[PDB]
Design a binder for this molecule. Structure first.
Ligand SMILES: Cc1n[nH]c2oc(=O)c3ccccc3c12
Length: 112
């Protein structure tokens, strides 16, 4: 087992910022984003969304050293939040959490 490369460390910092973000009430907005439900459980997502994405897929790719740069991981998160905001309506909580975590993601990015 190798120690994470310098790029994996920067990737991990972006990942953790999104994962660990809590609002003023202590709610961890990433909770619902960690693992997509199954096709059986959320069939309409799978009919609507061309490229499924969850944080577990991203974490696994990160830990495999498969991201070539920071922006490739950012793209996957952006895809995830866009999927969420396409499938769900602006009035839903998951939509608004996505917008908040999308902001958190870009802020973390700007600061690298
Ligand atoms: C539930 C649910 N409902 N709608 C969703 O959109 C998503 O993009 C997503 C991503 C990771 C985990 C769950 C979801 C999701």
């Amino acid at each position: 087992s190798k120690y994470m490369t310098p790029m994996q460390q920067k990737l991990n910092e972006v990942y953790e910022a999104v994962k660990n973000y809590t609002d003023k009430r202590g709610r961890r907005l990433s909770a619902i984003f960690l693992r997509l439900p199954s096709r059986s459980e959320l069939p309409d997502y799978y009919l609507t969304i061309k490229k499924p994405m969850d944080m577990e897929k991203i974490r696994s790719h990160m830990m495999a050293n498969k991201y070539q740069d920071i922006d490739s991981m950012v793209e996957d998160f952006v895809m995830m939040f866009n999927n969420a905001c396409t499938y769900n309506e602006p009035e839903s909580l998951i939509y608004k959490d996505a917008l908040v975590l999308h902001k958190v993601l870009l802020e973390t990015r700007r600061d690298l």
